[PDB]
Amino acid sequence: ADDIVLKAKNGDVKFPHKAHQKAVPDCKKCHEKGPGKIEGFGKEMAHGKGCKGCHEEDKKGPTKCGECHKK
């Protein structure tokens, strides 16, 4: 399957799956979550444990605005 882009108004956010599969071999960090996770995602989650928060805890991955968001 293809990578996906979240169409944030301030700039597209690419989600590169390959890098994540490699860097986060614990797949259950994202997969086999209970229902509601597709509906649940949004800005709050992205800037929290959904994207940015994990990068901050793991000490790797983009944590600056222009590193995630790119026109």
Ligand X SMILES: C[C@H](CCC(=O)O)[C@H]1CC[C@H]2[C@@H]3CC[C@@H]4C[C@H](O)CC[C@]4(C)[C@H]3C[C@H](O)[C@]12C
Numbered residues of the known binding site:
1, 9, 17, 20, 27, 30-31, 37, 47, 49, 51, 54-55, 60, 65, 68-69
Place of tokens 């956010």: 13
Helix (H, G, I), strand (E, B) or coil at 3: coil
Q: How far is the CB of 29 from ligand HEC (least distance, A)?
A: 4
Q: What mask of x and - would describe binding to ligand HEC in positions 31 to 60, judged by CB under 6 A?
A: x---------xxx--xx--xxx-xx--x-x
62/35 Cα distance (integer angstroms)? 27
Burial label, 20 (beta-carbon count in 10 A; 0-12, 13-18, 19+): middle
Instruction: State yes or no: residue 70 binds ligand HEC (CB under 6 A).
Output: no
3 lines the binding site for ligand HEC (CB under 6 A): yes
